[PDB]
Amino acid sequence: MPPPADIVKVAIEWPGAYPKLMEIDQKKPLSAIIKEVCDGWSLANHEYFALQHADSSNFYITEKNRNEIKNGTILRLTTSPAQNAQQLHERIQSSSMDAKLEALKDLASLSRDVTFAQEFINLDGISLLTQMVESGTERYQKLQKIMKPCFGDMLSFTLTAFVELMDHGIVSWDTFSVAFIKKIASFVNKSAIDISILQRSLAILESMVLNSHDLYQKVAQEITIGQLIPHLQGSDQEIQTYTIAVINALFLKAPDERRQEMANILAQKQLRSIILTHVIRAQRAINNEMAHQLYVLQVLTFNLLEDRMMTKMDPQDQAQRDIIFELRRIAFDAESEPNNSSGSMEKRKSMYTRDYKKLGFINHVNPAMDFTQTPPGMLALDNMLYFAKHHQDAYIRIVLENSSREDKHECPFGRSSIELTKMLCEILKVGELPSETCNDFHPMFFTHDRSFEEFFCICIQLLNKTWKEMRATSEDFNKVMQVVKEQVMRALTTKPSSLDQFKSKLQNLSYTEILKIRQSERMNQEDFQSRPILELKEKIQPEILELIKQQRLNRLVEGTCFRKLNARRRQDKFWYCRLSPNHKVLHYGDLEESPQGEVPHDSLQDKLPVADIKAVVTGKDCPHMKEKGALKQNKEVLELAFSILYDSNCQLNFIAPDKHEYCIWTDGLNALLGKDMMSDLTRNDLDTLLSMEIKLRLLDLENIQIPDAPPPIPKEPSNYDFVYDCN
Amino acid sequence: MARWIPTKRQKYGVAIYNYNASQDVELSLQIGDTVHILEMYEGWYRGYTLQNKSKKGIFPETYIHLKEATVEDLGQHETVIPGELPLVQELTSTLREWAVIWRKLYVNNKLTLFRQLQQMTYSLIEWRSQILSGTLPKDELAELKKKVTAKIDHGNRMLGLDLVVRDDNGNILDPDETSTIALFKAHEVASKRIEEKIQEEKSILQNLDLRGQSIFSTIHTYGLYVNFKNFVCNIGEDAELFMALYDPDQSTFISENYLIRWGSNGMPKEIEKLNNLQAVFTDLSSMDLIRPRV
C-alpha cells in the first residue's frame, strides 16, 4: 500500500554532465523533475528529454518506473524516448551507412524499452528500417558489392531491431515487406553467412511463422528443410536451435495430412538420426532449449502417430481385416494349416475361436475386436507391420508360443498388442502436444525413427520372457502388462540412448537379480519412513481430512468480521459471514463494525447456496481486481482478496483480515465444493496428527520390529467347523 | 477358519501391517490392532478385537505377532524388568484416552494445551520406548515411574479425569480395594499432588524463582561452577590469579582461592587449563545463599 521512499539519495547524470547526488522527490509529476534535472545542466526542454536508469536498462524513467530508483541508483539524463525515437528514425530511413549501423545496433538494444517503444511505434521508424534495408541496398549496391560483410551486419542489426520491436506488439508484425522476406530468403536459401545475419534471420523466420500460418505458408517456399539441414550442420549450436525451431513451427502449422508428408521428409533427410549424431551424440552441449528441441522432434513424430493412435479405424474394414489376415498368416500359419489362409467363413470362425481361446479373447468371432479399441487400433497393426519388416522373429515367436496355450497363461497378441502399444505410448507420451513444459529428450528415440516400434516389439519380447519367469496369466492380463510397465519404468528411468543400450536395459529387467537391489533401496528409503507402514497410515486417510473439514465448517459458522471492497471511507471493513448449520446458506453483507463478531441473523446477504457456487478466484484473478479504475487494489491485498463465484454475474469480491484465515475460508468453501484444501495449515496439522495416530499404533509391536514385507498366508481348515466355538 | 481352541495365551493378537479384507472380519489392519483372541486354530487366529470386543478378527497366525502373555507382562514375566510394565500398559490406556481427547481438541481451539498435550505425550512415549527394556538402572526406573505418574495425573486433572493412586510400582497396587482408610488417604495424597501441580504450574508459568527456592530447600550443597576464559591484559611478568568468595556483609573471606598461573605473555602459565580453566566452589549451604551481599 505505501508508496516508495519518496526522497531518494541518487546520482543524476547527463552526457557531459558531472553527476549530482541529490535527494530526488518522487511523488512530483516527473515532468518537473526532468525540468529541474535539465536546469541542473543549464538545460530547458524537459519534455524533449528523459531521465533514465544510468544502470543497465537505459529505460527512460516515466511516471511509471520511478519506484525503481534505489539509494545509489544513478540517474542519467538523455534525449526523451520520443527524441531518441526520432533521432533514430531520421537516421534510420537515411542512407549514410556507418551512422545507420550505430543507430541500428542501438535501436536493437533499446527496442525492448517500452517507454521508447511508445514513441518509436507512434513514429513508424520500423518502416524506416524497411527503407534502409530494402531500398538502402539498391541506393548503394555498387559499393555494397564489396561492403556486404558490413552491409550484412547492417541488415542483421535491422533484423534485431525489427523483431525486438515486433515482440512488444504495439508495432504491427506487418512492417516487414515482401522485400524483407526476400532478404531473409537470400539468407536462409544461401550458404553459411555472417553468423549474426543467419541467427537473427532464422529467428525472424520462426517469428513470422509464429505470426501467421499464412506467413509460414508464404515462407515455406523459401523455408525448405533440405536447405535447413545446413543450419543444423552449422557447428554453432544456435543455428541448430533455429533450424529445429523453424522445423517445429513447420510441423505445428503444417496440416496433419501434410504433417505426415513432412514426417516422411524428416525421416528421409535424417533429421532424427542426423541430429542424434550431430547434436545429441555429437559433442555439442544439449542446452535446455536444444533438449526441448529434441523433445519436440520426438513428440512431433509421436503426434504424427497420433492420427492413427486416437482414431478408431473400422475394425471390420475389409482392407485392414485382410492386413491383419496377412499378419496372422505370417503369425499363425506355422501351426495353422494353409487352408485357413484362404479359409471359409465357417473355418474362419473355427480358427478364430480355436486359437483365440488360445488367445483368451472374451469374443472369439473377430481378431479386430482386439483392434476395435483405440488408442491405438490400426496403429498397433502398424507396429506388427514394422515387425514384418524388422522383428519377424519376435512376432513369429510370440504368436506361436501363444498359438497353442489354451490356458490363461495365454498371451493374447491382438489384445496384448493393442493395449501394450497404447499403454507404452501413454508412457512415452506418444502423441501429446509438444510444449516448452517438457525438456527431456530420449536419445533412445533419435537412433531410430521407429524406436517406438522397436520399443513395442522388444517390450512385448521382455513381456513374454518374464511371462515365463513370473507365471504370467490372462486373468493377470492387465496385471502382466502392468508388471511389464514396471519393467519399462525401471528401464526408461535409466534414460536409454540407443537401441543396444535400450536392449541392455530391458535385459536387465528379466527378473534375474537386480530387483533385489531396487527393493534394497526401498528398504534403505523406508528406514526413515517405513513405506509399508506409510501404506497403513495414508490408506486410512479420509477420517483426518474430513474432521479437519468439519472443523473448518465450525470455523465458517463462527466466521469472522470479513473485509469489503475498498474499506476506506466509513465502510464496514468488519461484517460477519456466518455459515449456517445447514451449510447451504452464508449470512453476510454490509454488517456493522461488530466487536464480538457475528450477529447471527438474516444478514444483509443472508443467503449463499453452494448450488450457484463455481469456485473462488484468489487475488488478481478476482473480477474486482480486474477493475483498474476507482477500484484499484494494491497487490498487498492479493492474499486477502477473494472472489467467491456464484450466479455467473454476482461474486463475493471481498478482503480477508489476514492470510491464514483466507486460506482457511478457501479451504472451507472448497470442502463445501468437495475438493482439496489450500491451507498449508491443513498440510501441517494433517501430517502431524495422522503421523501421531500411527505412532499410536506401533504399540502392539514395540521392543520387536515388523516384518516389512507381507508374510504369507498360512493355511486354514477350509471349513468353518469350530473346535472352539465362536460367541 | 476351523479347528479353534480355547486358550488365553493369545490376547496379544498383534497385527503386523496393512491386512486385507480376504476374511469376513478383516481390513487394512494398523500396527497396534490388538485382538483379544479366543479361537485357537494353528495357522489362523480369530478373536475379539480391541476396537470391538464382541467382533472377531480372523488374521493369519504369521500375521499375528503373538506374544504369549496377556496384556500383563509379569505373570509370565514379559516385563523386561519386574514390577512396572503393568504401568506401561495402563500408560497405553492413558494414551488411548488422550486419543479421544486430541480428537476433541481441534473442535474447540484451546490448542495451547493441545501443544503441551503433544509434548507431554512425547515425553511419556519416549519414556515408554526407553523402558521397552530395562535400559535404565532400577532406581532410575522408579524415578521414571514417578515422572510418568506425574505427567499422567497432570493430563488427567487437565481433562478433569479421575485420580490415579499408588504413585510408584503400578498406580494400581493401592486401588485394589484391600483397605478403606489407606485408600481414602491415598486419594487425599493424590489430591495434594494435584494441588501442588496447579500451584506450581501457576507459579512456574508466571514466577520463575520460587520453584528454585523450593527445590533448594531439600538439598543444601551447591557449587558455583566457573569456567574462566582469559584475563584480558598483557602483564609482562609472571602472574598469580586467586579466585575466592568474599562477604562484605561479614567483611571477611569465605572460600579457598582457586589458583591460576599466568605467563608474562598475557598467557596462562599453564596451557592445559587454558581450555579447562574450571573451578567449582562448593559448600554453598542455605545460609550461604541467603546472605545479603556476597
Residue numbers in the entry:
A (entry chain A): 1 to 727
B (entry chain B): 1 to 294
From the paper:
The dedicator of cytokinesis (DOCK)/engulfment and cell motility (ELMO) complex serves as a guanine nucleotide exchange factor (GEF) for the GTPase Rac. RhoG, another GTPase, activates the ELMO-DOCK-Rac pathway during engulfment and migration. The DOCK-A (DOCK1/2/5) and DOCK-B (DOCK3/4) subfamilies specifically activate Rac and have an Src homology domain at their N-terminus; the Src homology domain is involved in autoinhibition and binding to engulfment and cell motility (ELMO) scaffold proteins. ELMO is structurally divided into two domains: an N-terminal domain (NTD), consisting of the Ras-binding (RBD), ELMO inhibitory (EID), and ELMO domains, and a C-terminal domain (CTD), consisting of the Pleckstrin homology (PH) domain and proline-rich region.
Therefore, to define the RhoG-bound structure, we analyzed the crosslinked DOCK5ΔC/ELMO1FL/Rac1G15A complex in the presence of excess RhoGQ61L using BS3. The cross-linked RhoGQ61L/DOCK5ΔC/ELMO1FL/Rac1G15A sample yielded a two-fold symmetrical reconstruction at a resolution of 3.8 Å. However, the ELMO1NTD was poorly resolved due to its high mobility. To address this, we symmetrically expanded and refined the particles focusing on ELMO1 NTD. Through 3D classification, excluding the DOCK5 DHR-2/Rac1 segment, ELMO1NTD was resolved into several conformations. One class, comprising approximately 12% of the particles, provided a map of sufficient quality to define the structure of DOCK5/ELMO1 bound to RhoG at 4.9 Å resolution. Cross-linking mass spectrometry confirmed RhoG’s placement within the cryo-EM map. RhoGQ61L formed a primary interface (∼440 Å2 buried surface area) with the ELMO1RBD and a secondary interface (∼260 Å2 buried surface area) with DOCK5C2 (A−C). Consistent with the previous crystal structures of the RhoG-ELMORBD complexes, the primary interface involved ELMO1 residues such as Lys9 and Leu21 interacting with the switch 1 and 2 regions of RhoGQ61L in the GTP-bound conformation. By contrast, the secondary interface consisted of aromatic or aliphatic amino acid residues, such as Val232, Phe345, and Trp400 of DOCK5, which interacted with Arg127 and Lys130 of the Rho insertion region (α3′ helix) of RhoGQ61L.
